[PDB]
Amino acid sequence: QGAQVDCAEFKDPKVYCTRESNPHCGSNGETYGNKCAFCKAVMKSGGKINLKHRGKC
Protein backbone atom coordinates (compact mmCIF):
# COMPACT_ATOMS: atom_id res chain seq x y z
CA GLN A 1 0.00 0.00 0.00
CA GLY A 2 0.93 3.64 0.44
CA ALA A 3 -1.24 6.47 -0.82
CA GLN A 4 0.85 8.15 -3.48
CA VAL A 5 -0.65 11.62 -3.37
CA ASP A 6 2.66 13.35 -2.73
CA CYS A 7 3.24 16.59 -4.62
CA ALA A 8 6.69 17.76 -3.61
CA GLU A 9 8.65 15.13 -5.50
CA PHE A 10 6.91 16.00 -8.75
CA LYS A 11 7.17 19.76 -8.57
CA ASP A 12 9.99 20.45 -11.00
CA PRO A 13 10.97 20.63 -13.65
CA LYS A 14 8.09 22.34 -15.48
CA VAL A 15 5.68 19.56 -14.67
CA TYR A 16 2.36 19.98 -12.89
CA CYS A 17 0.45 23.15 -13.76
CA THR A 18 -2.04 25.06 -15.86
CA ARG A 19 -3.61 22.37 -18.02
CA GLU A 20 -5.39 20.47 -15.27
CA SER A 21 -5.11 16.71 -15.68
CA ASN A 22 -7.68 15.86 -13.08
CA PRO A 23 -10.77 17.64 -11.67
CA HIS A 24 -9.99 16.62 -8.09
CA CYS A 25 -11.91 17.82 -5.07
CA GLY A 26 -10.53 18.73 -1.66
CA SER A 27 -11.75 17.83 1.80
CA ASN A 28 -14.74 20.11 2.24
CA GLY A 29 -13.00 23.14 0.86
CA GLU A 30 -12.36 23.31 -2.83
CA THR A 31 -12.75 21.99 -6.34
CA TYR A 32 -9.58 22.15 -8.39
CA GLY A 33 -7.18 19.58 -9.74
CA ASN A 34 -4.17 20.80 -11.61
CA LYS A 35 -1.41 19.16 -9.61
CA CYS A 36 0.09 22.59 -9.00
CA ALA A 37 -3.21 24.09 -7.87
CA PHE A 38 -3.75 21.35 -5.32
CA CYS A 39 -0.24 21.11 -3.90
CA LYS A 40 0.05 24.89 -3.91
CA ALA A 41 -3.24 25.39 -2.10
CA VAL A 42 -2.97 22.47 0.30
CA MET A 43 0.48 23.72 1.23
CA LYS A 44 -0.89 27.07 2.36
CA SER A 45 -4.19 25.47 3.38
CA GLY A 46 -3.75 25.55 7.14
CA GLY A 47 -3.29 21.87 7.90
CA LYS A 48 -6.89 20.69 7.89
CA ILE A 49 -7.68 20.24 4.21
CA ASN A 50 -7.57 16.52 3.51
CA LEU A 51 -8.87 15.05 0.30
CA LYS A 52 -11.92 13.36 -1.16
CA HIS A 53 -10.45 14.17 -4.56
CA ARG A 54 -12.70 11.94 -6.61
CA GLY A 55 -14.92 14.08 -8.81
CA LYS A 56 -16.64 16.55 -6.52
CA CYS A 57 -15.38 16.93 -2.96
CSV table of N, CA, C and O in Angstrom, one decimal:
chain,number,residue,atom,x,y,z
A,1,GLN,N,0.8,-1.2,0.0
A,1,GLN,CA,0.0,0.0,0.0
A,1,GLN,C,0.9,1.3,0.0
A,1,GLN,O,2.1,1.2,-0.3
A,2,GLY,N,0.2,2.4,0.4
A,2,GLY,CA,0.9,3.6,0.4
A,2,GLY,C,0.3,4.7,-0.5
A,2,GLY,O,0.7,4.7,-1.7
A,3,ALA,N,-0.6,5.5,0.0
A,3,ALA,CA,-1.2,6.5,-0.8
A,3,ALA,C,-0.1,7.3,-1.4
A,3,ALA,O,0.7,8.0,-0.7
A,4,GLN,N,-0.1,7.4,-2.8
A,4,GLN,CA,0.9,8.1,-3.5
A,4,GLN,C,0.4,9.5,-3.9
A,4,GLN,O,0.5,9.8,-5.1
A,5,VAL,N,-0.2,10.3,-3.0
A,5,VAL,CA,-0.7,11.6,-3.4
A,5,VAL,C,0.3,12.7,-2.9
A,5,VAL,O,-0.1,13.7,-2.4
A,6,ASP,N,1.6,12.4,-3.1
A,6,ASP,CA,2.7,13.4,-2.7
A,6,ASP,C,2.7,14.4,-3.9
A,6,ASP,O,2.4,14.0,-5.0
A,7,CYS,N,3.2,15.6,-3.6
A,7,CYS,CA,3.2,16.6,-4.6
A,7,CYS,C,4.5,17.5,-4.6
A,7,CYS,O,4.6,18.5,-5.3
A,8,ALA,N,5.4,17.0,-3.8
A,8,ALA,CA,6.7,17.8,-3.6
A,8,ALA,C,7.7,17.2,-4.6
A,8,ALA,O,8.4,17.9,-5.3
A,9,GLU,N,7.8,15.9,-4.6
A,9,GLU,CA,8.7,15.1,-5.5
A,9,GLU,C,8.4,15.2,-7.0
A,9,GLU,O,9.2,14.7,-7.8
A,10,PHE,N,7.3,15.9,-7.3
A,10,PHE,CA,6.9,16.0,-8.7
A,10,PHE,C,6.7,17.5,-9.1
A,10,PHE,O,6.0,17.8,-10.1
A,11,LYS,N,7.3,18.3,-8.3
A,11,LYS,CA,7.2,19.8,-8.6
A,11,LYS,C,7.9,20.1,-9.9
A,11,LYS,O,7.2,20.4,-10.9
A,12,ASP,N,9.2,20.1,-9.8
A,12,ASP,CA,10.0,20.4,-11.0
A,12,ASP,C,10.4,19.2,-11.7
A,12,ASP,O,10.3,18.1,-11.1
A,13,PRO,N,10.9,19.4,-13.0
A,13,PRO,CA,11.0,20.6,-13.7
A,13,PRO,C,9.9,20.9,-14.7
A,13,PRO,O,9.8,20.1,-15.6
A,14,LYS,N,9.2,22.0,-14.6
A,14,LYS,CA,8.1,22.3,-15.5
A,14,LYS,C,7.2,21.1,-15.7
A,14,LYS,O,7.1,20.6,-16.8
A,15,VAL,N,6.6,20.7,-14.6
A,15,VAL,CA,5.7,19.6,-14.7
A,15,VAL,C,4.2,19.8,-14.5
A,15,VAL,O,3.4,19.9,-15.5
A,16,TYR,N,3.7,19.8,-13.3
A,16,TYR,CA,2.4,20.0,-12.9
A,16,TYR,C,1.6,21.3,-12.8
A,16,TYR,O,1.4,21.8,-11.6
A,17,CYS,N,1.2,21.9,-13.9
A,17,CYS,CA,0.5,23.1,-13.8
A,17,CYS,C,-0.4,23.4,-15.0
A,17,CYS,O,-0.5,22.7,-16.0
A,18,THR,N,-1.1,24.5,-14.9
A,18,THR,CA,-2.0,25.1,-15.9
A,18,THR,C,-3.1,24.1,-16.4
A,18,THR,O,-4.2,24.1,-16.0
A,19,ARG,N,-2.7,23.3,-17.4
A,19,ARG,CA,-3.6,22.4,-18.0
A,19,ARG,C,-3.9,21.2,-17.0
A,19,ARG,O,-3.2,20.2,-17.0
A,20,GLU,N,-4.9,21.4,-16.3
A,20,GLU,CA,-5.4,20.5,-15.3
A,20,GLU,C,-5.6,19.1,-15.8
A,20,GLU,O,-6.3,19.0,-16.9
A,21,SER,N,-5.0,18.1,-15.2
A,21,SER,CA,-5.1,16.7,-15.7
A,21,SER,C,-5.9,15.8,-14.7
A,21,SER,O,-5.7,14.7,-14.6
A,22,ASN,N,-6.9,16.5,-14.0
A,22,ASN,CA,-7.7,15.9,-13.1
A,22,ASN,C,-8.6,16.7,-12.2
A,22,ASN,O,-8.0,17.3,-11.3
A,23,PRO,N,-9.9,16.8,-12.5
A,23,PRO,CA,-10.8,17.6,-11.7
A,23,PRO,C,-10.8,16.9,-10.3
A,23,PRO,O,-11.7,16.0,-10.3
A,24,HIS,N,-10.0,17.3,-9.4
A,24,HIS,CA,-10.0,16.6,-8.1
A,24,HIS,C,-10.6,17.6,-7.0
A,24,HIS,O,-10.3,18.8,-7.1
A,25,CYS,N,-11.3,17.0,-6.1
A,25,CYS,CA,-11.9,17.8,-5.1
A,25,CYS,C,-11.6,17.6,-3.6
A,25,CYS,O,-11.7,16.5,-3.0
A,26,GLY,N,-11.0,18.6,-3.0
A,26,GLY,CA,-10.5,18.7,-1.7
A,26,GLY,C,-11.4,18.2,-0.6
A,26,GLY,O,-12.5,17.7,-0.8
A,27,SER,N,-11.0,18.3,0.7
A,27,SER,CA,-11.7,17.8,1.8
A,27,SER,C,-13.2,18.3,1.8
A,27,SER,O,-14.1,17.5,1.4
A,28,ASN,N,-13.4,19.5,2.2
A,28,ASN,CA,-14.7,20.1,2.2
A,28,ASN,C,-14.4,21.6,2.0
A,28,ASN,O,-15.1,22.5,2.5
A,29,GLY,N,-13.4,21.8,1.1
A,29,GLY,CA,-13.0,23.1,0.9
A,29,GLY,C,-13.0,23.6,-0.6
A,29,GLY,O,-13.4,24.8,-0.8
A,30,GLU,N,-12.4,22.9,-1.5
A,30,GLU,CA,-12.4,23.3,-2.8
A,30,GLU,C,-12.2,22.3,-4.0
A,30,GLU,O,-11.7,21.2,-3.9
A,31,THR,N,-12.8,22.8,-5.1
A,31,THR,CA,-12.7,22.0,-6.3
A,31,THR,C,-11.7,22.6,-7.3
A,31,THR,O,-11.7,23.7,-7.7
A,32,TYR,N,-10.7,21.7,-7.5
A,32,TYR,CA,-9.6,22.1,-8.4
A,32,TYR,C,-9.0,20.9,-9.0
A,32,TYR,O,-9.8,20.0,-9.3
A,33,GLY,N,-7.7,20.8,-9.2
A,33,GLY,CA,-7.2,19.6,-9.7
A,33,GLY,C,-5.9,19.6,-10.4
A,33,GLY,O,-5.2,18.5,-10.5
A,34,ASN,N,-5.5,20.7,-10.9
A,34,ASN,CA,-4.2,20.8,-11.6
A,34,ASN,C,-3.2,20.5,-10.4
A,34,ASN,O,-3.4,21.2,-9.4
A,35,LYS,N,-2.4,19.6,-10.6
A,35,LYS,CA,-1.4,19.2,-9.6
A,35,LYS,C,-0.8,20.4,-8.9
A,35,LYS,O,-0.7,20.3,-7.7
A,36,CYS,N,-0.5,21.4,-9.6
A,36,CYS,CA,0.1,22.6,-9.0
A,36,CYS,C,-1.0,23.2,-8.1
A,36,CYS,O,-0.6,23.5,-6.9
A,37,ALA,N,-2.2,23.5,-8.7
A,37,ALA,CA,-3.2,24.1,-7.9
A,37,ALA,C,-3.4,23.4,-6.5
A,37,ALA,O,-3.3,24.1,-5.5
A,38,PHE,N,-3.6,22.1,-6.6
A,38,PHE,CA,-3.7,21.4,-5.3
A,38,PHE,C,-2.6,21.4,-4.3
A,38,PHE,O,-2.8,21.7,-3.2
A,39,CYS,N,-1.4,21.1,-4.8
A,39,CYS,CA,-0.2,21.1,-3.9
A,39,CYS,C,-0.1,22.5,-3.3
A,39,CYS,O,0.1,22.7,-2.1
A,40,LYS,N,-0.1,23.5,-4.3
A,40,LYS,CA,0.0,24.9,-3.9
A,40,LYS,C,-1.0,25.4,-2.9
A,40,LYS,O,-0.6,26.1,-1.9
A,41,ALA,N,-2.2,25.0,-3.0
A,41,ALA,CA,-3.2,25.4,-2.1
A,41,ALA,C,-3.1,24.6,-0.8
A,41,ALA,O,-2.9,25.3,0.3
A,42,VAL,N,-3.1,23.3,-0.9
A,42,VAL,CA,-3.0,22.5,0.3
A,42,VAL,C,-1.8,22.9,1.2
A,42,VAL,O,-1.9,22.8,2.4
A,43,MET,N,-0.7,23.3,0.5
A,43,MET,CA,0.5,23.7,1.2
A,43,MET,C,0.0,24.8,2.2
A,43,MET,O,0.1,24.7,3.4
A,44,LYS,N,-0.4,25.9,1.6
A,44,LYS,CA,-0.9,27.1,2.4
A,44,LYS,C,-2.4,26.9,2.6
A,44,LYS,O,-3.2,27.8,2.3
A,45,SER,N,-2.8,25.8,3.1
A,45,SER,CA,-4.2,25.5,3.4
A,45,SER,C,-4.5,25.8,4.8
A,45,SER,O,-5.5,26.4,5.2
A,46,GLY,N,-3.6,25.3,5.7
A,46,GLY,CA,-3.8,25.5,7.1
A,46,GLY,C,-3.4,24.3,7.9
A,46,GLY,O,-2.8,24.4,9.0
A,47,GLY,N,-3.6,23.1,7.3
A,47,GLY,CA,-3.3,21.9,7.9
A,47,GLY,C,-4.5,21.1,8.3
A,47,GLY,O,-4.5,20.3,9.3
A,48,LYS,N,-5.6,21.4,7.6
A,48,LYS,CA,-6.9,20.7,7.9
A,48,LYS,C,-7.7,20.5,6.6
A,48,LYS,O,-8.9,20.3,6.7
A,49,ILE,N,-7.0,20.5,5.5
A,49,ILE,CA,-7.7,20.2,4.2
A,49,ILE,C,-7.2,18.9,3.6
A,49,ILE,O,-6.2,18.9,2.9
A,50,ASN,N,-7.9,17.9,4.0
A,50,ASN,CA,-7.6,16.5,3.5
A,50,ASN,C,-8.2,16.4,2.1
A,50,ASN,O,-8.6,17.5,1.6
A,51,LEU,N,-8.3,15.2,1.6
A,51,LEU,CA,-8.9,15.1,0.3
A,51,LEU,C,-9.9,13.9,0.1
A,51,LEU,O,-9.8,12.8,0.6
A,52,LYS,N,-10.8,14.2,-0.7
A,52,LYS,CA,-11.9,13.4,-1.2
A,52,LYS,C,-12.0,13.7,-2.7
A,52,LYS,O,-13.0,14.0,-3.3
A,53,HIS,N,-10.8,13.8,-3.2
A,53,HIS,CA,-10.5,14.2,-4.6
A,53,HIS,C,-11.2,13.6,-5.7
A,53,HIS,O,-11.0,14.1,-6.8
A,54,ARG,N,-12.0,12.5,-5.5
A,54,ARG,CA,-12.7,11.9,-6.6
A,54,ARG,C,-13.9,12.8,-7.0
A,54,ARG,O,-14.9,12.9,-6.3
A,55,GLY,N,-13.8,13.3,-8.3
A,55,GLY,CA,-14.9,14.1,-8.8
A,55,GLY,C,-15.1,15.3,-7.8
A,55,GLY,O,-14.1,15.9,-7.5
A,56,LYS,N,-16.3,15.5,-7.4
A,56,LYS,CA,-16.6,16.5,-6.5
A,56,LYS,C,-15.9,16.2,-5.2
A,56,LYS,O,-15.3,15.1,-5.1
A,57,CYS,N,-16.0,17.1,-4.3
A,57,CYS,CA,-15.4,16.9,-3.0
A,57,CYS,C,-16.0,15.7,-2.3
A,57,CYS,O,-17.1,15.3,-2.8
